[PDB]
Amino acid sequence: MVGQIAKEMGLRAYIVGGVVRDILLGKEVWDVDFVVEGNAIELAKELARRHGVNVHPFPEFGTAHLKIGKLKLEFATARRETEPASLKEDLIRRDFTINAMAISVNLEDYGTLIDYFGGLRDLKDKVIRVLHPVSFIEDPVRILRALRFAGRLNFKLSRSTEKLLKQAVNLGLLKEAPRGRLINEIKLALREDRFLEILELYRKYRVLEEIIEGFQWNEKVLQKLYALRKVVDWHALEFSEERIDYGWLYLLILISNLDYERGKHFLEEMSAPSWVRETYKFMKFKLGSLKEELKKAKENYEVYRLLKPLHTSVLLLLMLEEELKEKIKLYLEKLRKVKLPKEKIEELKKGKELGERIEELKREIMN
RNA sequence: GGCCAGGUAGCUCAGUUGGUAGAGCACUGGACUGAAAAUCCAGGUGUCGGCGGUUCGAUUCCGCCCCUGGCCACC
Ligand SMILES: Nc1ncnc2c1ncn2[C@@H]1O[C@H](COP(=O)(O)CP(=O)(O)OP(=O)(O)O)[C@@H](O)[C@H]1O
Numbered sequence: 531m532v533g534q535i536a537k538e539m540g541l542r543a544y545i546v547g548g549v550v551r552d553i554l555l556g557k558e559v560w561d562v563d564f565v566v567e568g569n570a571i572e573l574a575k576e577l578a579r580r581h582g583v584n585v586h587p588f589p590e591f592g593t594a595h596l597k598i599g600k601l602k603l604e605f606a607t608a609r610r611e612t613e614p615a616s617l618k619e620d621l622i623r624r625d626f627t628i629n630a631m632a633i634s635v636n637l638e639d640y641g642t643l644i645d646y647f648g649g650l651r652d653l654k655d656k657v658i659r660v661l662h663p664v665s666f667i668e669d670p671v672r673i674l675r676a677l678r679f680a681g682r683l684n685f686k687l688s689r690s691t692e693k694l695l696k697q698a699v700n701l702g703l704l705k706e707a708p709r710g711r712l713i714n715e716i717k718l719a720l721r722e723d724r725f726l727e728i729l730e731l732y733r734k735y736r737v738l739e740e741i742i743e744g745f746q747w748n749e750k751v752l753q754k755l756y757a758l759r760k761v762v763d764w765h766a767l768e769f770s771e772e773r774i775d776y777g778w779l780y781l782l783i784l785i786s787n788l789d790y791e792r793g794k795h796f797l798e799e800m801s802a803p804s805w806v807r808e809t810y811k812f813m814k815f816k817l818g819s820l821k822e823e824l825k826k827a828k829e830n831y832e833v834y835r836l837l838k839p840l841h842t843s844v845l846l847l848l849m850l851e852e853e854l855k856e857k858i859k860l861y862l863e864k865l866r867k868v869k870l871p872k873e874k875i876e877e878l879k880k881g882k883e884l885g886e887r888i889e890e891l892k893r894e895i896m897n
Numbered sequence: 898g899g900c901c902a903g904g905u906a907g908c909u910c911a912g913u914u915g916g917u918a919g920a921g922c923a924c925u926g927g928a929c930u931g932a933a934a935a936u937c938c939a940g941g942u943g944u945c946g947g948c949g950g951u952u953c954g955a956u957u958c959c960g961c962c963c964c965u966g967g968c969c970a971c972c
């Protein structure tokens with residue numbers, strides 16, 4: 531309907547940015563970004579009115595958001611900076627060529643891909659490339675972004691882009707960038723499935739040393755990250771109904787050697803979930819004694835008592851130990867599964883003494 | 898969109914090792930009154946947001962959503 535409305539208003543609208551990329555990569559997304567030559571607000575209002583849905587205008591931003599079905603539509607007026615601006619002037623202000631393309635929703639040329647900067651070629655060559663030499667200097671956050679994309683899509687940085695990125699980091703612009711945008715970019719990164727590869731890129735270009743104060747790389751943490759990858763793969767394979775957010779575990783491994791103060795402060799800035807904070811605080815202190823107790827575990831009910839109250843994350847962190855692995859597994863796919871029939875339970879019931887008795891019966895069954 | 902609280906009677910508010918729920922003022926009924934109010938006895942004051950899952954058993958553990966407030970990211 532957008533093409534028709536644009537025709538009636540004598541305008542030109544374009545699907546723009548990441549949405550295009552994802553499409554060419556065969557990935558379908560529910561968030562669609564439009565750039566309009568002319569007033570975007572009125573186009574959005576008319577689209578919303580014709581579909582009979584609510585509209586959310588932002589006149590100062592010159593953008594409007596509306597939702598149709600599961601589609602989230604964002605309409606933005608073309609602008610030459612973050613006189614009317616051409617679509618090209620709006621595309622050239624973006625980060626990377628693969629993000630810089632556009633698909634025309636205008637009726638005459640409809641479907642046509644618009645690529646000024648050679649983003650389709652870079653998409654075909656698996657290349658991450660900035661539009662201009664000052665790109666990373668303009669928005670240091672992009673330093674992370676590039677890596678993320680390279681991590682996600684298994685692309686590589688251009689020679690020029692790699693040089694410029696390294697130069698940007700060397701200028702210390704990572705410290706000059708707003709803390710919020712960087713932290714948010716990292717939050718975006720840990721949601722990736724290829725997040726470990728991104729972390730590798732982080733290590734290579736040494737961006738973590740700038741963002742997290744006191745943080746340094748070593749081999750133990752790295753190997754712990756890969757072992758964590760193995761465990762995460764296995765758990766997300768067999769136990770997949772029980773899945774949680776995995777990237778946070780990697781993050782905990784990274785800051786594991788950091789001071790509790792800096793760790794707590796970073797997890798504070800990251801706005802981490804409660805179970806992340808709890809798992810961190812448990813890892814920093816009680817995890818050691820817990821492991822030493824698991825070493826002293828003989829009967830299965832002791833393992834039960836020591837494990838069952840814990841969260842999934844703590845167990846996954848416990849699986850990092852070779853000797854404890856098969857034990858944790860045995861607890862998972864065997865030990866904690868059991869039940870009792872009617873008459874028996876009825877005899878067991880004849881307060882908290884019922885619970886204690888049930889515990890006695892369970893430890894009687896196990897051992 | 899991410900996260901943090903908050904969700905407890907009509908309203909304003911506490912409650913952790915899961916094990917049979919509470920206060921201050923409205924609610925009914927009767928004793929009391931010519932009627933009413935007060936007061937006494939008392940007792941509703943509640944699937945402790947909604948829906949699934951784990952558990953013998955979930956306000957509690959977890960997952961998906963609703964509502965409100967605040968930190969933000971809103972290229
Ligand atoms: N720092 C930046 N500099 C220039 N453009 C940026 C940018 N950050 C985001 N964008 C632009 O905004 C558009 C997409 O917006 P976003 O949704 O915020 C990032 P994305 O590429 O779609 O991946 P994402 O959906 O996982 O966040 C892209 O055209 C992209 O070039």
Ligand SMILES: [Mg+2]
Nearest residue numbers: 548549559561
């Ligand atoms: Mg997006």
